């Protein structure tokens, strides 16, 4: 389904209760006439920033909060602003998870933490310590059983152990340059993990489905997983319980804790409808219950419902494990940390590197263009287009507006203050190109040469508008010459967009992104 006024499209990961949500959707449609479509696309968390940066994607995106800081800093999520009576219905720490630079950028739904899940018949009392698991496994393989199987393919699952004795991602006001994935406690935890594998107690190939089948068939005594998984266990009839993770070197396993959150695409035209559905249909007792029946959510943010749920021993264990871990950061670098630790675990586990070589790759890779260019080009394109219509030029693909939500306001403000600048300098600009004497062979160096000399002494929002008006005029001038066609129009639009992504994106984000632009130049 495509974005469409008067309808909602929702993206949510395939392990959640999407059929229960769909039923809330149906009820909404019955009561209001508005159609809700729920989808669960593959790799949705990597697609969203690619397609949102071009004006596409869902109205509402569901994911844990660690991904959203990167999206918001790119301008892809709309700010959220509920009434006090509603904010008060949910727990405050869940709102803190979705606060990025003072702005709430999503609705918190449920608190998620890994717990140890065990087969009460084959392990009637579960181990309290990681270290005692190797002895338990030889004891169970004696019986054609295993002690423990969990997903070694996603770092989420192994991180509680890596963190236990001192592993950390970013030092806390977070220092990009102090990561801590190659400290001694990290090396110690991943060594335990890799030793379990080399000593034949786990298989480095094991993944989500292999572990679930194992446990729900009765072939392994334990697994590590979140509340979404309880539903399939109940169907298996296995006699299980849910409890606190084991300790490593005397200290708790420290899981990175996620808050399932619903963010609203900054390109959506249904922002207000999305909010009142979430607040009056999802975030009630009857709404969360419909989803919970499909796949358990965990510890819900909604006070009135969690007070019943809390009496389930499985939720008690969820919250115990959550208090021993850390709420994940939401910052943009979280992505590169996870990717770096993915490779390091996978490589140490398989055997292609030592721990010391891998976690030292993870250290450098954890620290430090095209996607931002596509962002900027939307803005650059709306403004070059208008200047083209102003001169009477008809250029393919620069016909008509059709702007989508974020750029509407930005475009408006940019034209207002841009006309300010050149109205006060009508001669200089009208003769600008007759000075330069551009040609196909001198065009690129002249464009760079001048742009660089604008900014050599420093940057401000006005030097950026001056720059955007220069490049726009440069473009219109290229369209005018029969030896430089419509081909030079998109070409110069690209020069401008890349120049911004390359040379100015840092300053622009430091001064607040386009929302800062909107406020600096705001009216009356």
């Amino acid at each position: 389904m495509k974005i469409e006024e008067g309808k909602l499209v929702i993206w949510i990961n395939g392990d959640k209760g999407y059929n229960g949500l769909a039923e809330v959707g149906k009820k909404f449609e019955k009561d209001t006439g508005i159609k809700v479509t729920v989808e669960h696309p593959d790799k949705l968390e990597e697609k969203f920033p690619q397609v949102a940066a071009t004006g596409d994607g869902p109205d509402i995106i569901f994911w844990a909060h660690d991904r959203f800081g990167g999206y918001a800093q790119s301008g892809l999520l709309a700010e959220i602003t509920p009434d006090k009576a509603f904010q008060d219905k949910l727990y405050p720490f869940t709102w803190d998870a979705v606060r990025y630079n003072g702005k709430l950028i999503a609705y918190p739904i449920a608190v998620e933490a890994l717990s140890l899940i065990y087969n009460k018949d084959l392990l009637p009392n579960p181990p309290k310590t990681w270290e005692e698991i190797p002895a338990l496994d030889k004891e169970l393989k004696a019986k054609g059983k295993s002690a423990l199987m969990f997903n070694l393919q996603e770092p989420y699952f192994t991180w509680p152990l890596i963190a236990a004795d001192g592993g950390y991602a970013f030092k806390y006001k977070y220092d990009i340059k102090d990561v801590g994935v190659d400290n001694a406690g990290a090396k110690a935890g991943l060594t335990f993990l890799v030793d379990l594998i080399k000593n034949k107690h786990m298989n480095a190939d094991t993944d989500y489905s292999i572990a679930e089948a194992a446990f729900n068939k009765g072939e392994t005594a334990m697994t590590i997983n979140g509340p979404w998984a309880w539903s399939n266990i109940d169907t298996s009839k296995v006699n299980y319980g849910v409890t606190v993770l084991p300790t490593f070197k005397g200290q708790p396993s420290k899981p990175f804790v996620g808050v399932l959150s619903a963010g609203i695409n900054a390109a959506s035209p249904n922002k207000e409808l999305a909010k009142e559905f979430l607040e009056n249909y999802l975030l009630t007792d009857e709404g969360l219950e419909a989803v919970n029946k499909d796949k358990p959510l965990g510890a819900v943010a909604l006070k009135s419902y969690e007070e019943e749920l809390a009496k389930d021993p499985r939720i008690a264990a969820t919250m115990e494990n959550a208090q021993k871990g850390e709420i994940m950061p939401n910052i943009p670098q979280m992505s590169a940390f996870w990717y770096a630790v993915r490779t390091a675990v996978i490589n140490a586990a398989s055997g292609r590197q030592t721990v010391d070589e891998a976690l030292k790759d993870a250290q450098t890779n954890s620290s430090s263009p095209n996607a931002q260019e596509d962002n900027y080009k939307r803005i650059v394109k709306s403004y070059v287009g208008e200047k083209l219509r102003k001169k009477g030029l008809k250029i393919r693909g620069y016909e008509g507006e059709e702007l989508k939500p974020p750029v509407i306001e930005i475009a408006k403000t940019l034209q207002r203050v841009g006309d300010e600048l050149e109205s006060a300098n009508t001669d200089f600009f009208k003769n600008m190109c007759d000075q330069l004497q551009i040609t196909p062979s001198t065009a690129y160096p002249t464009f760079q040469s001048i742009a660089d000399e604008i900014f050599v002494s420093g940057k401000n929002w006005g030097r950026v508008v001056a720059f955007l008006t220069f490049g726009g005029n440069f473009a219109v001038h290229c369209a005018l010459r029969a030896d430089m066609g419509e081909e030079y129009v998109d070409r110069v639009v690209n020069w401008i967009s890349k120049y911004m992504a390359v040379n100015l994106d840092y300053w622009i984000n430091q001064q607040g992104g386009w929302d800062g632009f909107l406020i600096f130049f705001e009216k009356t």
Binding site: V417, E420, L421, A424, N425, F428, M432, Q435, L436, T446, S449, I450, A451, D452, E453, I454, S457, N460, W461, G462, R463, V464, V465, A466, F467, F470, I519, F520, F521, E522
Partner: peptide
């Protein structure tokens, strides 16, 4: 040849600064 470019660029800078100064307050 290009020192014209330097002239043009110096002008664009001063032009941009004027715009910023006209909006320092809201």
């Amino acid at each position: 040849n290009g020192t014209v470019n330097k002239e043009v660029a110096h002008c664009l800078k001063r032009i941009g600064d004027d715009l910023v100064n006209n909006h320092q307050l809201n």
